[PDB]
Symmetry: C2
Subunit: 437 residues, 2 copies
Amino acid sequence: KQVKISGKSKENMSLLKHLKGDVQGKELVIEDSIVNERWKQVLKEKIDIEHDLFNYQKNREISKVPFLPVDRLITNDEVEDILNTLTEVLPTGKFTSGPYLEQFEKVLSTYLHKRYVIATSSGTDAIMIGLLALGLNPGDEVIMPANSFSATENAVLASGGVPIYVDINPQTFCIDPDKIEEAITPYTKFILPVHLYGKHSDMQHIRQIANRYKLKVIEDACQGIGLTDLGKYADITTLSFNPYKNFGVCGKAGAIATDNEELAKKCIQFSYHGFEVNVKNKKVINFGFNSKMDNLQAAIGLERMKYLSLNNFKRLFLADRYITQLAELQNKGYIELPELSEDHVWHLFPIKVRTEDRADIMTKLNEDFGVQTDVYYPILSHMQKTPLVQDKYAGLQLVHTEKAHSQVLHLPLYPSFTLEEQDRVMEGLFHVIKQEI
Amino acid sequence: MQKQVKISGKSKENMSLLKHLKGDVQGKELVIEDSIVNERWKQVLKEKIDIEHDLFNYQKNREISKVPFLPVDRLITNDEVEDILNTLTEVLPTGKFTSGPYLEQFEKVLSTYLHKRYVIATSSGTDAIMIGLLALGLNPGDEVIMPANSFSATENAVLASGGVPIYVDINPQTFCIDPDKIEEAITPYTKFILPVHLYGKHSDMQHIRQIANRYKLKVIEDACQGIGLTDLGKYADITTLSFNPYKNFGVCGKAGAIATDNEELAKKCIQFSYHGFEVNVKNKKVINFGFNSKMDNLQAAIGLERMKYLSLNNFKRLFLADRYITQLAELQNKGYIELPELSEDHVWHLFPIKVRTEDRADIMTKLNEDFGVQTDVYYPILSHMQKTPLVQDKYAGLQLVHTEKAHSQVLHLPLYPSFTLEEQDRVMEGLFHVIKQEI
């Protein structure tokens, strides 16, 4: 009878169906949570998504479609809320530690269903501190994919750890659990899956393996906020609140989330100079970092977080539209579409095109249509031109990772993107693609 | 034939300004260097200045029940809040919060203020030291010569980068590393000297450079408390700063900077500061790894506002320290305490006096209970006495006589730009009353 808005990816999916006529129940019920706040001012019984959420203007004039214009990633209402909260924050004089930081950590805890949240100065820092809190020693091996953002390998390397790259599932872009056990040595301590593009990795299977081999699991969920059951099978979950993520602040920040008390204590010590928790200047471990989130950014996060469920839903609506209206191109085998799944928060939108055509498709979309696309990310880990790669990752081949990487093409997708712009993207893809994969 | 007096805002020039602004004639001889750090001076300098009244609003007869050591709400003024709100009104809608134009502009201003060719703004002073060591070519196990009485960030940066701290005794008068004790400690594994301008006092950099040259060592200074020091960085390979909110100049969150004249070195700092990428080419790595440690565009915008108060704020700190040193003279004359020396090479981030080792706890307790005067000790525990596995394992048997003795005597008195002279009166009165024994 009741259709509940949690804001999480599973319920978003059922909300999507329900609003497309397909009744999932009677009463729209909005869960009493900070992440659902902006929904309340726009969600009405007879809501029309195209008009109420996107203000669809089919005939608005469009010459260029930028892939990700940063100015549009923050709205006018967000600006007003931020200025309003800073008006109160600034005179308190508390900019590093303070009450907004604590409140942000409490709110995240509830949203993630994790007992302990340590907010950090970036996502990169979260992974780095997480590895160390979990006991990483120099030379310990960490199993992970090679198609993530460089921050992932970087956090392992900076801590003294050793990346062991394993091939991916070519459709999900995520680490193939069936390739993990092969790569376990007596020096392997961790598995580090990445929920790439917003797609959830096969965490249950990863957990079975990990318990088998007594490894720890720390996930890079920096692109995966809003995923149903995020962290259910992880020892540590890491997040980024960088301004370009599904939810971000106004600078650098991230978080570590865990259910283990002793683990949390250690993360806090590593995040702040190795001090005894809340006892300044008294070290209890060898060293630590200066890597807590700023009180000021936390105050901003408490405002920007009000838009999260609404924005994740708008991302889902966008991804659904793409998948539906481009179906004919996958039907003719010209492109491959991502699967419409509950275990996706659509941080990025990956289609697949023919390898030898991608650069041409990209150029034509831009030249003829003003449509900008991109490829996240241009270089794989084991193909970076560094002294480390040549000495350590020589002649390594990851067939699926490399092939998928050669084919992946990302389309504009973000909460303030417009349907009219999306139409131009799609109209463009049809007019320029004329060969199969 | 009149000598001009340049208001650079640096420590040397502030010292002479202190005399001229105590004097009767204040005319066209006072030349304000065209710099953002001097902005808040332009308005107030167009008339004759009475420091007590114009800068401090001296209210000798005000009721004071408590003197907090560092009330953080008073470290940011109303005009600072307003300027910040005004600039953020412009920054926020641009949507640029990581990289951006205020960041580049803040680095450029710093480069001019410090007289250093390259400034790399970082996410904290702690990261500046860590990145600086790595860019200078630190390898795991490399020994770093340093004092043991700094904030923990100094040693934490050495250790996080793979370095090995080697602690050397200080000059007990200045609290800075004793150049005369550095040479003794040099081994084949020594690669760096890391002096700290502690409390805002300038280390003996010329002598340290001599030793460094002689043994081919790199010098990276922790100047995180030393912004405004004359000739800062002159003999350093890398200078590091902090713009933590509590510093002489700070932003509204964490940030710091690396300063250097060496171009190839600057390049490496950038690479380390941002994922090991080629400069201005995202996703393309040219070194093994790097960090996510640039300063944020938004904090840079706030920095460009707050920096307008630096020269004036540094001047007020000096006037405060000078006032302490003069009015407390008698306590030093009678041998009860030791006062710092009124020098040109100090920016007075903190104000250290020395009291009798045996009486300090009692002095502090009585100041607070009988008079509401809060004092403090930066920092409570020395590096070689931290209860950590590393210390208990590798730094057992290490004795640093001067560091330990001076650390047992030191007492910091409240001093920040918005501190009032009437609060200062009460600090000083309390000190006269509670103290009765010599050192």
